[PDB]
Amino acid sequence: PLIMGVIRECGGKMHLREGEFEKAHTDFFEAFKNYDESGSPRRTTCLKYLVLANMLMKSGINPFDSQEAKPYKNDPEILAMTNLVSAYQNNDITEFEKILKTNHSNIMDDPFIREHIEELLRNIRTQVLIKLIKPYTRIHIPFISKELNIDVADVESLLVQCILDNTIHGRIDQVNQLLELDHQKRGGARYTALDKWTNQLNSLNQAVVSKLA
Amino acid sequence: SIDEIYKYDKKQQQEILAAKPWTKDHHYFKYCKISALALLKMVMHARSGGNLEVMGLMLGKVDGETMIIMDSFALPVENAQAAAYEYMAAYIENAKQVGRLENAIGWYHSHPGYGCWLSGIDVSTQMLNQQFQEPFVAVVIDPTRTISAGKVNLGAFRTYPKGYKPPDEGPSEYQTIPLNKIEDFGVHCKQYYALEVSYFKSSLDRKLLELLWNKYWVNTLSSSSLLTNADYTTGQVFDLSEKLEQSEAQLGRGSEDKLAKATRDSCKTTIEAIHGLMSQVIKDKLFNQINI
Ligand SMILES: CC(C)n1nc(C(F)F)cc1C(=O)Nc1ccc([C@H]2[C@@H](O)CCCc3cncn32)c(-c2ccccc2)c1
Ligand SMILES: [Zn+2]
CA of B118 from ligand 2 middle (Å) equals 6
**Strand B103-110 with B138-141, pairing:** parallel
Of B62, B179, B63, B194, nearest to B126 by C-alpha is B194
B178/B184 Cα distance (integer angstroms): 10
Burial of residue A87 (number of CB atoms within 10 Å: 0-12, 13-18, 19+): buried
CA diameter of chain A: 96
Element at B259 (helix H, strand E): helix B258-283
Start-end of H helices in B116-257: 120-132, 143-149, 182-187, 203-221, 225-228, 231-252
Q: Are B104 and B168 in contact (CB under 8 A)?
A: no
Measured in degrees and rounded to the nearest 5, phi and psi for residue B104 equal: -65, 145
B253/A211 Cα distance (integer angstroms): 11
User: Does the Cβ of B121 fall within 6 Å of ligand 1?
Assistant: yes
Please give the interface size between A and B, counted as residue pairs whose CB atoms are below 8 Å apart. 37
B1/B22 Cα distance (integer angstroms): 29
Task: Point out which residues pair with B60 in neighbouring strands.
Answer: B69, B103
Resolution of this entry, Å? 3.3
3-state helix, strand, coil in chain A (%, to 5): 65, 5, 30
A31/B209 Cα distance (integer angstroms): 79
**Strand A138-140 with B138-141, pairing:** unpaired
Of B103, B182, B129, B148, nearest to B276 by C-alpha is B148
Q: How far is CA B266 from CA B7, B55, B116, B181, B238, in A?
A: 48, 31, 19, 18, 11
Indicate the Cα dihedral angle B259, B264, B269, B270, nearest 10°: 90
B260/B247 Cα distance (integer angstroms): 9
| Distance from the B242 Cα atom to the nearest Cα atom in chain A, whole angstroms | 8
The chain A residue lying nearest B232, using CA atoms, is A190
B107/B152 Cα distance (integer angstroms): 18
Element at A81 (helix H, strand E): helix A80-90
User: Does the Cβ of B139 fall within 6 Å of ligand 1?
Assistant: no
Q: Which of B230, B231, B238 has its CB closest to that of A196? A: B238
Measured in degrees and rounded to the nearest 5, phi and psi for residue B33 equal: -120, 130
Q: Which of A196, A197, A207 has its CB closest to that of B251? A: A207
**Strand B66-74 with A170-173, pairing:** unpaired
Q: Strands of B14-75 (E only): list them.
A: 31-35, 55-63, 66-74
Three-state DSSP class for B8?
coil
Testing ligand 1's pocket by substitution, the residue of B81, B116, B121 carrying the most ligand atoms inside 8 A of its CB is B121
Ligand found nearest the CA of B192: 2
CA of B55 from ligand 2 middle (Å) equals 9
Residues of B in contact with A197 (CB under 8 A): 237, 240-241, 244
Task: Point out which residues pair with B243 in neighbouring strands.
Answer: none
B145/B139 Cα distance (integer angstroms): 15
**DSSP conformation class of A61:** -
- Number of neighbours of residue A74 by Cβ within 10 angstroms: 11
HSE-up of residue A132 (Cα within 13 Å, Cβ side):
22
Element at B195 (helix H, strand E): strand B192-200
- The closest-lying atom of ligand 1 relative to the alpha carbon of residue B75 is 3
Q: Are B153 and B165 in contact (CB under 8 A)?
A: no
Measured in degrees and rounded to the nearest 5, phi and psi for residue B210 equal: -65, -40
User: Does the Cβ of B128 fall within 6 Å of ligand 1?
Assistant: yes
**Strand B31-35 with B192-200, pairing:** parallel
CA of B151 from ligand 2 middle (Å) equals 20
Q: For chain B, what's the residue count?
A: 292
Q: How far is CA A144 from the centre of its chain?
A: 18
Structure determined by: cryo-EM
Start-end of H helices in A58-164: 70-73, 80-90, 93-102, 111-132, 141-148, 152-164
**DSSP conformation class of A78:** S
Residues of B in contact with A208 (CB under 8 A): 251
